[PDB]
C-alpha cells in the first residue's frame, strides 16, 4: 500500500469584497430606497438631504451617474435568494474610494489603467453605455460560475 | 423631549437587531346546567405577534 | 530571501455578534490568513514565480 496526500487551493475573492488595505473611504450614512441592492454592484444617489445629512440610494439606472459600490458585511446584510443583499429601508455600506472586487458580465480580461464602463443593471461590461471615472486595477478572477473584476474607485 | 414624556424600559439586549412581542385572547362561554349532563361548552385561547427593529 | 504578507478587517458590531451568538468571526479569518501563507509557500516551491526569478 502506498500512502497518498492531497492538495486544494481556496478562492481569491468574493463579490463585493474589499480588495486590499490601500487608502479607502466608506460612506456609511446612506439609506436604501425603492428596491434591493446586490453586493458588488454600483449604486446611484437620488436625493441628498440638505439638513438631516443622509443620502438616498438605489440600484443604477440608464442615464444616471454612479456614486459607489456596496461592500460585504456580516451584520448589516440580510441573507435572501441564497446570497447577500441590501434590503429596502436599511443602512448600506457604500465605498467611494479604493480598490474593490465587483460583479462583471464580460468575457475578456481588461487592460490596466483603462476606463470602466457599466451596464444598465449596475454591473461591469466592456461595451456598456454608462461612462465612469473609475479605472481597472488588474485583478480578474472567477468564483464558482461567477465572474469578478478588480476596480479602483476615485472620489466623486 | 420624547425620553421624559414617554415610558422608558430596559428589557432588550445590545446584540439583538430585531424583536417580537405577543398578545393573547380568549374565547368561550358557560351555560346553566343540570346534573347528569354531558354536553358542556368548551373554551380556547389564541395569540398574535408583532415585530420591531 | 523573500517576505510574505496579508491582512484582514473586522468591525465592533461583528465582534459583539460573535461574542453573543457563540461563533466568533475573527478566529476564522486568522485561520484563513495562516492557510493562505502556507499555501503560498507550497505554491512557490512547486510552481515558482517568473517575475521574481
Amino acid at each position: 500500500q502506498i500512502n497518498a496526500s492531497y492538495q486544494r487551493d481556496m478562492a481569491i475573492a468574493l463579490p463585493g469584497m474589499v480588495a486590499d488595505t490601500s487608502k479607502y473611504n466608506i460612506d456609511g450614512a446612506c439609506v436604501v430606497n425603492e428596491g434591493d441592492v446586490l453586493v458588488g454592484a454600483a449604486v446611484q444617489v437620488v436625493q441628498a438631504q440638505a439638513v438631516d445629512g443622509h443620502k438616498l440610494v438605489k440600484a443604477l439606472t440608464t442615464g444616471t451617474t454612479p456614486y459607489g459600490v456596496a461592500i460585504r458585511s456580516h451584520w448589516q446584510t440580510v441573507n435572501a435568494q441564497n446570497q447577500m443583499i441590501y434590503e429596502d429601508g436599511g443602512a448600506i455600506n457604500v465605498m467611494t474610494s479604493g480598490r474593490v472586487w465587483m460583479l462583471s458580465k464580460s468575457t475578456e480580461a481588461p487592460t490596466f489603467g483603462s476606463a470602466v464602463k457599466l451596464d444598465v443593471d449596475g454591473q461591469e461590461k466592456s461595451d456598456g453605455t454608462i461612462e465612469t471615472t473609475w479605472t481597472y486595477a488588474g485583478g480578474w478572477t472567477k468564483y464558482k460560475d461567477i465572474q469578478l473584476v478588480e476596480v479602483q474607485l476615485h472620489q466623486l | 423631549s420624547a425620553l421624559r414624556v414617554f415610558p422608558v424600559t430596559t428589557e432588550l439586549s445590545p446584540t439583538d437587531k430585531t424583536f417580537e412581542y405577543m398578545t393573547f385572547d380568549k374565547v368561550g362561554t358557560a351555560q346553566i346546567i343540570a346534573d347528569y349532563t354531558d354536553d358542556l361548552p368548551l373554551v380556547d385561547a389564541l395569540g398574535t405577534s408583532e415585530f420591531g427593529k | 530571501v523573500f517576505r510574505l504578507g496579508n491582512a484582514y478587517l473586522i468591525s465592533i458590531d461583528e465582534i459583539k455578534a460573535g461574542q453573543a451568538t457563540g461563533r466568533p468571526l475573527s478566529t476564522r479569518k486568522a485561520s484563513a490568513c495562516q492557510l493562505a501563507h502556507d499555501q503560498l509557500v507550497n505554491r512557490l516551491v512547486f510552481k515558482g514565480s517568473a517575475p521574481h526569478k
Binding site: 496526500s5 492538495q7 | 389564541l46 | 492557510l35 502556507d38
Partner: peptide, 24 residues
C-alpha cells in the same frame, strides 16, 4: 393564530462542519 411559534420548538446542532483545504 396560536400560542407557540416555530422558533420556540427549534434546535441547532452543537457541532458544525468545516470545508477542507489541505496545505500540501
Amino acid at each position: 393564530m396560536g400560542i407557540w411559534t416555530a422558533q420556540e420548538l427549534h434546535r441547532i446542532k452543537s457541532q458544525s462542519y468545516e470545508e477542507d483545504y489541505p496545505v500540501g
